[PDB]
Design a protein around this ligand. Structure first.
Ligand SMILES: CCCCCCCCCCCCCCCCCC(=O)OC[C@H](COP(=O)([O-])OCC[N+](C)(C)C)OC(=O)CCCCCCCCCCCCCCCCC
Ligand SMILES: CCCCCCCCCCCCCCCCCC(=O)OC[C@H](COP(=O)(O)OCCN)OC(=O)CCCCCCCCCCCCCCCCC
Ligand SMILES: CCCCCCCCCCCCCCCCCC(=O)OC[C@H](COP(=O)(O)OCCN)OC(=O)CCCCCCCCCCCCCCCCC
Ligand SMILES: CCCCCCCCCCCCCCCCCC(=O)OC[C@H](COP(=O)(O)OCCN)OC(=O)CCCCCCCCCCCCCCCCC
Ligand SMILES: CCCCCCCCCCCCO[C@@H]1O[C@H](CO)[C@@H](O[C@H]2O[C@H](CO)[C@@H](O)[C@H](O)[C@H]2O)[C@H](O)[C@H]1O
Ligand SMILES: CCCCCCCCCCCCO[C@@H]1O[C@H](CO)[C@@H](O[C@H]2O[C@H](CO)[C@@H](O)[C@H](O)[C@H]2O)[C@H](O)[C@H]1O
Ligand SMILES: CCCCCCCCCCCCO[C@@H]1O[C@H](CO)[C@@H](O[C@H]2O[C@H](CO)[C@@H](O)[C@H](O)[C@H]2O)[C@H](O)[C@H]1O
Ligand SMILES: CCCCCCCCCCCCO[C@@H]1O[C@H](CO)[C@@H](O[C@H]2O[C@H](CO)[C@@H](O)[C@H](O)[C@H]2O)[C@H](O)[C@H]1O
Ligand SMILES: CCCCCCCCCCCCO[C@@H]1O[C@H](CO)[C@@H](O[C@H]2O[C@H](CO)[C@@H](O)[C@H](O)[C@H]2O)[C@H](O)[C@H]1O
Lengths: 670, 64, 48, 72, 81, 73, 100, 494, 61
């Protein structure tokens, strides 16, 4: 069974991709969807199997790489952390598959699309079920190849081809650092298996753990889209909406977080990386909360919301409460997938327009979508007793619960980042559903009012909700977004819970802050995020509905003109990357090609020896005039030079100077 | 000091209002009426609140 | 065909995978002189 | 309203058939045939790797210690 | 509205709107070979999964019914007094 | 050799590709080309080589545990 | 212990892993000394491989308290890790160390 | 006779039959091309027979023949695990190299087949010879057939391309000859068994190193000395390009396991920082200038320079892992570079007559089978996992980091830069917009010939990526013999 | 299907006891010492000729 969870998504991908002609769009959709539905059911069972019974499962198939001290197997371990990740990965993958039957119905290439969906699920399973870091890297690269294949699904569009280059190469930068980090592990311990690395971790050189932890963290920025290497994640919104719901906001983005959570038995022995994890987390939350409030694309806002939540989990990891980060990771993939599938539904209704400035009303036209995205937005802001309430609000009070400067700092930073989250959540829900209509009448012209006479049969197209294959995922994910946090709060938060007591999430007694977070933190800071959400939400509603002039005053002031464009342009990080990193590399390639390879390497080489020697040989060849009188003089000359050399006992070097002088005199013309 | 164009940003913002007369007034009047009046837009901003509020009061009265 | 060990250690030197018998005790002396820290690796076994 | 499946595999139009250029005979029977016959033979190749030899000695040294249990 | 496309282009994934009229028969056949392949990997799992802790006798654990290591344990434990 | 399919060969791109191919025939030794050539061929390799010599055998990570130092030398 | 396999008689070295007292111009004795040293270095590295496999099963068996149940295996693996590498015979063949 | 001499006679017998068939019939060129192809398959069947019998843990050369008669120059053939996979790679490529270029030659077809059948013998010999002068004899006997292969069947800039390869390879190899002659003078023979026993004085080693490395640096090739390859590979016919990249670029890689690792160890150790400094530079510069190359076939050639540098730093690591990774990356390069050359030189050039990346766009829309294989060969060039190219790079890069960490850290940047050019080339030809407008008429997709050699080459790259132990089990014991070093408690046993 | 069938057939068995084909394959490629005996003879001669080449080329004029 366990090895069958791994195998099923792979087989459905192969049928849809290499045999799409035989099965057709219907047969590809059925085999692809059914295989991942079956895998999802087998994985829910494996959660009861492994986690609730504390029975880890080991299976090794054959060796991959065999050398001295290097034995890396095609082996898989199922523990409490593995089955925890598999549930959001396979529930969301199953639902996005069912969703994609309705969303991609009109597209010409459905077999290729559904094949890439199953290929992504297979690779994500490989990433969380591996025995060792090198097989986890296969899923890491595999998910990257699948994200490139899905961002660039519409290859005809150049924008898509630029954005897929960004995703591929910004993730290769993280891969370089993981490869260095895995080299460090092999160099120190001789093998990179999890049992080996974690059993020996308490004793390794403390500075060796620094090198591995930094390399593991740098690799984690690229995939988890942390501020240093995050430019790719918003560009991955070029691919179709269901791709952005699973890969770009509910599964692959979390792999960086999984890498740190898996490596907890190692990075816990280096508090130096834990400060970097923590500050890395707090920066990305305010960095991306500010940007999303000034975006005009709905997908761009929901992409910048995901990076604000990924920054929350990395903050929790550096806070040294891994069960909290795992709890947020699973809870977030339910409501972030909901908002993306809900946004995808309004894009479908409004003729593929993705701009808030052209959406209005629509609340009466898309009632289910509005309520469902209201479900998602209340857990995104962690409204009390929602699924996101138990995960996001425990990260905040755990930051203040570690009574340190860095903890109180990140609490202030993260709380401000939460304020801007509430602002762009109102923006999305107000401008798409609650504001006056800002788009053409075609989305709002019904048949109850007669605008036509001889064309009443057709041509109204008034923004209707989709079909069963579209709404069904949205309803299910809504139920998760309301109740999943409560029903699983003990498995993850607990107080002395033993769910991860198979060393899947190792907390060192020195770093435990759980008891203080339960008792030490004052009620004011415990309740503080709630008042801010309720107060800002009403303030932004009035400034968007009642008092709409004031924001016009801000953006028409030169101060606010610069502040609006600064955050709209994403801190100008894209600007400085193309101009000083990307273009710098393309100039360097040109200078090597133009001035060195085709320049001085051929001048101080074959071409300069060619043109130099041909000139020399013509001059010496011009000494031969076929005159016996002049040839006789040469013999006497060459006779005397031999007599001088072997009678004046001259230094042999004096001769070589003569030859080099003579040769270079024939090198000069005229 | 004033530009050759009559554009002044202070005066521009003064006119950021709903104009009294507009040649396009009737062409745009559909966006503020009917389904798009103030009440109608926010009539169902909280879908299940009305049904839930009365239902929760029924459960709340359990003393009797 | 074979040479004194001292002859080769003169041209290449110990280190870079050339760990002649007695390399660890010498390295301790070398590291103590330059870093001023005594090398004493940890046990790795709670028992003995 | 899905369309019929289409295309010309190998560029052979729906009228005619694939014309054998000449390479096909040796490449399918000799080149690939040799690899399947090599694959089936490789299964019965005795294992003369250093590790299968070194594992068995290594087990007999660790069996002489509490690290590995001996069947005797 | 469907895109105009060239009809001489052969693709393993079908191309632009490819559904055969035998789609159901072919899909049925691919389902059986999937089911047959996944049946072999299952029997591999049953005989090669490794556990260092056996489940409780009365506690829900459906692996008990096909994995050999557990079946060897539970049959051995069913011999006492 | 074999006839190829018809390509609308752009005279502008054809002469550009011809330019890239014969470009070496026009390289000169200027103050600029020498400066770029000296930087790339001498300075960068000499800097990389110098660090390679200074840090050679400096560190080893195998089996090094707490209480031991990474530095070999 | 485990019986010595038939395959483990054909490749078993007949000479000690050394070059001392080995005439180099006797190629037969020399190649067997080369083989004897390589086989020993390899047994040492597979000894650590097998200890590492036991460590892993003690790790997945003890889970949380592996830090107080798997220490003997950790000792042996860390001993072998510092001492067994496959370094070849070439240095050994070309230098003599007096041990005095 | 031995079985290693049968490897050499069969390609010679095929040369004879092509030359004499016209004397029994005006015969078709199709009959000449079946003879050459059946002859290369038989060499591949013998080589698979040799591999079945081969002992993976034996320190004696195998399949040798008792000469018992000594002359000034005598051919001595033997096989060790270090050379068996180089022989197999030569015998899998040569059949595909012929099939790939089956229609593209058209004129002088007998001459073309005779040169390849002659090249197969000379490249097979260079791996089978048990002397270092005999190694040089065949490592340089390939230069006259390759001068005439490029000149007779090459592209437009063929004359200069063929002069570059011959003169650079002749010049570079004449510094190797001086070093080989010196070792023979000091020892009295170049037979491997006698030379490997002998230990040179450090100063002799440091000057023998200067001369074997100068040869190898030209033939790797390193960055400032790679001009011949940028000309040779591009102007060469498709078949010549496949041989030159897959097999000839590996002669220097296999020559370090014979001429440097076992007989000049102290020199290799004390000079590795010079090698690594060069290898690091040629990783960066080659990759920066591969990004701005506008000829597709010359973009595949430049990619080869960056990969050869990773395997060159791997052979100089003094580590078991980097040495086996170097051989794996050379085997991996043999399959992937062959496929990318087939795509650029044998599918695009066949249909367009152009190599300029300006003219290609959206080729996936009309050629979906080409784009699938082209993507897989681009990913392997990028060292993606599941391909043999990833395993070789990882082991080559790890031994580089363990030897001198800093240089392996720069060399690890190949993970970002090989990816950069591979995807950028891919997105500009297969993707990048709709089918170009420079294509007046539609292009057909892959032929059953083009498909099945691309599929065969991809199949070797992926299967060997999953289970590299097919090649790793053979090299372990034999690689163990080229490591220099001791451990303080494992050595000098009593 | 063939790979599953071929792999199943070519397995050794419960405890050792190789199959007939395994016996045949190991028998043909035995070469118990015949590579060693031929290499040693050739190494001995080429070592002699090196001594001879040195004797003839370094003789007193
Ligand atoms: C397994 C899944 C294979 C899917 C193959 C899909 C296919 O045939 O695409 C043809 C498609 C065309 O299929 P199509 O049906 O859309 O064709 C319609 C018409 N045109 C040709 C215009 C699109 O061509 C491509 O786009 C090829 C791009 C490369 C696809 C590569 C897929 C495999 C990737 C493996 C990743 C390995 C990572 C390891 C780590
Ligand atoms: C996405 C991945 C899809 C994979 C599809 C193909 C699946 C192939 C499954 C092969 C299963 C082999 C089962 C072998 C059981 C172990 C018995 C054995 O020892 O075989 C030797 C060899 C190496 O396996 P081993 O040494 O045991 O490694 C330790 C982990 N058990 O084991 C072998 O025999 C393997 C030799 C061939 C491996 C496959 C290579 C082509 C793929
Ligand atoms: C572009 C170019 C590959 C990347 C490089 C490898 C990874 C980093 C390597 C350097 C750090 C490791 C060696 C440090 C040696 C040392 O002595 O540092 C000690 C110090 C921590 O000391 P202490 O707090 O006592 O340790 C914990 C005790 N309980 O350690 C420190 O405080 C180290 C300083 C902090 C390092 C933070 C990360 C810096 C990253 C720089 C850019 C990398 C790219
Ligand atoms: C439609 C085309 C699909 C193309 C992709 C197909 C992928 C799966 C391919 C089928 C895999 C099994 C068939 C492999 C053929 C080779 C047979 C073999 O080497 O062993 C396979 C093994 C069956 O061996 P078994 O009979 O169970 O031995 C013990 C019996 N007491 O059975 C196994 O080892 C099962 C494990 C296989 C690997 C599972 C995934 C692990 C890696 C991810
Ligand atoms: C994975 C690829 C990279 C791996 C190779 C790079 C490893 C880098 C290791 C750096 C640390 C090496 O070992 C380190 O050296 C520094 C000096 O530089 C010393 O550092 C020491 O500094 C002061 C003196 O100034 C000492 O009092 C203190 O005890 C210690 O911190 C120690 O010897 C050791 O902490
Ligand atoms: C380390 C430094 C370098 C090491 C040694 C490498 C030296 C290589 C030098 C080769 C010089 C080129 O060699 C010379 O090239 C020119 C092309 O320009 C050839 O000239 C030929 O090509 C031209 C191209 O227009 C044609 O008109 C015609 O086919 C012919 O004249 C010469 O026949 C050849 O002799
Ligand atoms: C990484 C670099 C590796 C280099 C390896 C060795 C390459 C060969 C070294 C010598 C190369 C010849 O070098 C070249 O010689 C000839 C001498 O006539 C000169 O060639 C040129 O001289 C001047 C330019 O200065 C010109 O006006 C003249 O037309 C031309 O002959 C070049 O000034 C010189 O660059
Ligand atoms: C050391 C020297 C360098 C060696 C390099 C290897 C060179 C190998 C060359 C192959 C032998 C020559 O190849 C020879 O080419 C000539 C071309 O005129 C052919 O001769 C024939 O060719 C075609 C065949 O239809 C006829 O149109 C032509 O009239 C006739 O001459 C021979 O049948 C062929 O055998
Ligand atoms: C670029 C051109 C660089 C110069 C050409 C290479 C020079 C090589 O020449 C080198 O000279 C030194 C000088 O004694 C000699 O090197 C060695 O000679 C004898 C060994 O027989 C020793 O006693 C001497 O101690 C040692 O230096 C060798 O003759 C040769 O290794």
């Amino acid at each position: 069974m366990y090895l069958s969870i791994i195998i099923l998504p792979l087989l459905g991908s192969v049928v849809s991709g290499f045999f799409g002609r035989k099965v057709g769009v219907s047969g590809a959709q059925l085999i692809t969807c059914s295989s991942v539905i079956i895998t999802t059911i087998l994985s829910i069972i494996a959660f009861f199997e492994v986690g609730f019974n504390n029975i880890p499962v080991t299976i090794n198939i054959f060796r991959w790489i065999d050398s001295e001290w290097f034995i890396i197997n095609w082996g898989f371990q199922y523990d409490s952390l593995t089955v925890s990740m598999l549930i959001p990965v396979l529930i969301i993958s199953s639902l996005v598959h069912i969703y994609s039957i309705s969303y991609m119905s009109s597209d010409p290439h459905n077999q290729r699309f559904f094949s890439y969906l199953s290929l992504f699920t297979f690779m994500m399973i490989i990433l969380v079920t591996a025995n060792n870091y090198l097989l986890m890297f296969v899923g890491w690269e595999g998910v990257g190849v699948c994200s490139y294949l899905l961002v660039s699904f519409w290859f005809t569009r150049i924008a898509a081809n630029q954005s897929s280059i960004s995703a591929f190469l910004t993730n290769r930068v993280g891969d370089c650092f993981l490869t260095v980090g895995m080299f460090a592990i092999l160099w120190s311990l001789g093998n990179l298996d999890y049992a080996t690395v974690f059993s020996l971790a308490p004793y390794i050189n403390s500075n060796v753990v620094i090198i591995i932890g930094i390399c593991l963290l740098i690799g984690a920025m690229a995939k988890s889209s942390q501020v240093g290497l995050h430019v790719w994640l918003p560009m991955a919104m070029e691919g179709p909406t269901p791709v952005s719901a699973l890969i770009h906001a509910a599964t692959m983005v979390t792999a960086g977080v999984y890498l740190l959570m898996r490596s907890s038995p190692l990075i816990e022995y280096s508090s130096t990386v834990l400060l970097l994890c923590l500050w890395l987390g707090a920066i990305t939350t305010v960095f991306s909360s500010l940007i999303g409030l000034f975006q005009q694309d709905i997908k761009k806002v929901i992409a910048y919301s995901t990076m604000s939540q990924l920054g929350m989990m990395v903050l929790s990891i550096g806070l040294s409460s891994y069960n909290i980060a795992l709890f947020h990771l699973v809870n977030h993939a339910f409501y972030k997938a909901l908002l993306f599938l809900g946004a995808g539904s309004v894009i479908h209704a409004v003729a593929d327009n993705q701009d808030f400035r052209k959406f209005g009303g629509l609340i009466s036209y898309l009632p289910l979508t509005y309520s469902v995205m209201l479900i998602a937005s209340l857990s995104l802001v962690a409204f009390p007793f929602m699924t996101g309430f138990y995960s996001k609000d425990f990260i905040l009070e755990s930051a203040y619960g570690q009574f340190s400067f860095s903890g109180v700092a990140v609490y202030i930073i993260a709380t401000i980042g939460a304020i801007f989250t509430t602002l762009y959540s109102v923006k999305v829900l107000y401008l798409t559903f609650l504001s006056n209509p800002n788009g053409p009448r075609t989305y709002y012209r019904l048949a109850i009012d007669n605008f036509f006479s001889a064309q009443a049969i057709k041509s109204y197209k008034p923004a209707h909700e989709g079909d069963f294959f579209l709404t069904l995922p949205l309803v299910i994910l809504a139920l998760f977004s309301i109740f999943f946090g409560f029903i699983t709060k003990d498995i993850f938060i607990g107080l002395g819970s033993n769910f991860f007591v198979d060393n899947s999430l190792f907390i060192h007694p020195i770093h435990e802050i759980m008891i203080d977070t339960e008792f030490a933190v004052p009620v004011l800071f415990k309740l503080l995020p709630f008042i801010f959400t309720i107060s800002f939400s009403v303030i932004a509603l009035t400034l968007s509905e009642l008092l709409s002039e004031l924001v016009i005053y801000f953006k028409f002031s030169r101060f606010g003109y610069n502040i609006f464009g600064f955050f709209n342009q994403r801190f100008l990080i894209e600007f400085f990357y193309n101009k000083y990193i990307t273009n710098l590399i393309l100039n360097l390639g040109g200078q090597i090609t133009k001035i060195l390879d085709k320049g001085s390497i051929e001048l101080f080489g074959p071409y300069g020896l060619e043109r130099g020697l041909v000139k020399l040989s013509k001059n010496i060849s011009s000494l031969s005039t076929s005159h016996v009188t002049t040839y006789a003089l040469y013999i006497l000359v060459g006779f005397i030079l031999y007599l001088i050399y072997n009678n004046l006992l001259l230094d042999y070097s004096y001769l070589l100077l003569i030859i080099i002088l003579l040769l270079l005199l024939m090198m000069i013309g005229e | 000091k004033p530009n050759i164009t009559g554009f002044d940003m202070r005066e521009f913002l003064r006119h950021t209002k709903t104009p009294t007369y507009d040649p396009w007034e009737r062409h745009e009047a559909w966006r503020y009426t009917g389904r798009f009046s103030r009440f109608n837009r926010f009539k169902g901003a909280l879908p299940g609140f009305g049904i839930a509020t009365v239902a929760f009061t029924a459960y709340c009265v359990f003393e009797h | 065909r074979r040479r004194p060990i001292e002859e080769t250690l003169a041209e290449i030197g110990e280190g870079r995978g050339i760990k002649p018998p007695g390399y660890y005790e010498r390295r301790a002396q070398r590291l103590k002189e330059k870093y001023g820290v005594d090398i004493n690796p940890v046990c790795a076994d709670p028992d003995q | 309203q899905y369309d019929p499946p289409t295309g010309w595999l190998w560029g052979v139009r729906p009228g005619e058939k694939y014309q054998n250029e000449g390479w096909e005979g040796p490449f399918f029977y000799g080149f690939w045939g040799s690899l399947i016959v090599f694959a089936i033979a490789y299964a019965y190749k005795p294992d003369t790797s250093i590790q299968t030899w070194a594992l068995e000695e290594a087990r007999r040294r660790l069996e002489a210690e509490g690290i590995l249990e001996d069947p005797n | 509205p469907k895109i105009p496309y060239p009809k001489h282009v052969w693709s393993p994934a079908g191309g632009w709107y490819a559904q055969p009229a035998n789609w159901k028969q072919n899909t049925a056949i691919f389902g059986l070979v999937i089911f047959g392949i996944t049946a072999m990997v299952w029997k591999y799992s049953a005989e090669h999964e490794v556990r260092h802790k056996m489940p409780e006798p009365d506690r829900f654990y459906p692996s008990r019914y096909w994995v050999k290591q557990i079946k060897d344990y539970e049959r051995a434990q069913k011999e006492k007094q | 050799g074999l006839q190829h399919y018809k390509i609308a060969m752009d005279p502008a791109l054809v002469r550009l590709g011809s330019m890239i191919s014969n470009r070496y025939k026009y390289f000169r030794w200027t103050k600029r080309t020498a400066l770029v050539s000296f930087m790339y061929v001498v300075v960068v390799p000499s800097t990389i080589g110098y660090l390679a010599y200074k840090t050679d055998g400096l560190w080893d990570l195998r089996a090094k545990r707490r209480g031991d130092l990474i530095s070999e030398r | 212990p485990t019986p010595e396999s038939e395959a483990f008689l054909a490749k078993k070295p007949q000479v000690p892993p050394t070059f001392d007292g080995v005439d180099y111009e006797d190629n037969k004795r020399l190649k067997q000394a080369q083989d004897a040293i390589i086989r020993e270095q390899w047994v040492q590295v597979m000894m650590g491989r097998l200890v590492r496999e036991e460590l892993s099963k003690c790790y997945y068996r003890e889970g949380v308290n592996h830090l107080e149940k798997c220490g003997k295996l950790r000792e042996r693996y860390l001993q072998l890790l510092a001492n067994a590498k496959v370094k070849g015979y070439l240095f050994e063949q070309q230098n003599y160390w007096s041990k005095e | 006779m031995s079985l290693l001499y049968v490897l050499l006679i069969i390609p010679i017998i095929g040369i004879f039959l092509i030359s004499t068939i016209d004397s029994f019939y005006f015969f078709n060129v199709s009959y000449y091309k079946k003879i050459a192809l059946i002859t290369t398959i038989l060499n591949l069947i013998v080589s698979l027979i040799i591999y079945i019998l081969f002992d993976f843990s034996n320190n004696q050369f195998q399949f040798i023949q008792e000469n018992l008669d000594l002359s000034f120059y005598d051919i001595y053939l033997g096989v060790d695990g270090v050379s068996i996979y180089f022989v197999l790679l030569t015998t899998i490529i040569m059949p595909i190299a012929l099939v790939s270029n089956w229609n593209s030659i058209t004129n002088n077809i007998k001459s073309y087949l005779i040169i390849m059948l002659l090249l197969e013998t000379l490249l097979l010999a260079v791996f089978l010879v048990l002397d270092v002068l005999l190694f040089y004899i065949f490592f340089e006997s390939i230069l006259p057939p390759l001068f005439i292969l490029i000149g007779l069947f090459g592209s437009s800039n063929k004359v200069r391309a063929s002069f570059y390869i011959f003169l650079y390879t002749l010049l570079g190899s004449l510094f190797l000859l001086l070093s080989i002659l010196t070792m023979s003078s000091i020892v009295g023979t170049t037979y491997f068994d006698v030379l490997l026993k002998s230990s040179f004085e450090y100063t002799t080693q440091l000057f023998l190193f200067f001369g074997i490395f100068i040869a190898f640096a030209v033939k790797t090739p390193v960055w400032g000395l790679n001009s011949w390859l940028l000309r040779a590979h591009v102007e060469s016919p498709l078949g010549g390009s496949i041989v030159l990249a897959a097999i000839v670029l590996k002669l220097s890689l296999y020559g370090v396991f014979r001429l440097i690792l076992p007989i000049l160890p102290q020199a290799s150790l004390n000079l590795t920082y010079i090698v690594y400094a060069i290898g690091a530079i040629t990783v960066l510069y080659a990759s920066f200038s591969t990004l701005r190359t506008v000829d597709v076939k010359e973009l595949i050639a430049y990619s080869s320079v960056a990969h050869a540098a990773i395997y060159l730093m791997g052979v100089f690591s003094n580590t078991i892992q980097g040495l086996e990774g170097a051989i794996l990356l050379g085997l991996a390069h043999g399959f992937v570079s062959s496929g990318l050359f087939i795509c650029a030189g044998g599918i695009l050039y066949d249909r367009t007559g152009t190599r300029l990346i300006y003219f290609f766009r959206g080729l996936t829309q009309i050629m979906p089978l080409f784009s699938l294989f082209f993507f897989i060969l681009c990913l392997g060039n990028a060292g993606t996992p599941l391909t043999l190219n990833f395993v070789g790079e990882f082991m080559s890069l790890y031994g580089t980091l363990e030897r001198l960490p800093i240089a392996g850290m720069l060399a690890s940047t190949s993970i970002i830069f090989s990816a950069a050019y591979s995807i950028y080339m891919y997105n500009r030809i297969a993707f990048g917009g709709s089918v170009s407008l420079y294509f007046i008429d539609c292009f057909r997709d892959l032929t059953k010939r083009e498909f099945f050699i691309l599929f065969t080459l991809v199949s070797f790259t992926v299967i060997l990526g999953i289970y590299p132990s097919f090649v790793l089990d053979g090299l372990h014991y034999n690689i163990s013999s080229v490591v220099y070093g001791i451990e303080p408690n494992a050595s000098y046993l009593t | 299907a063939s790979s599953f069938v071929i792999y199943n057939i070519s397995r050794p068995g419960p405890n050792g006891e190789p199959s007939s084909l395994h016996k045949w394959f190991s028998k043909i490629s035995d070469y118990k010492d015949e590579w060693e005996t031929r290499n040693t003879l050739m190494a001995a001669a080429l070592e002699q000729a090196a001594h001879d080449k040195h004797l003839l080329l370094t003789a007193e004029r």
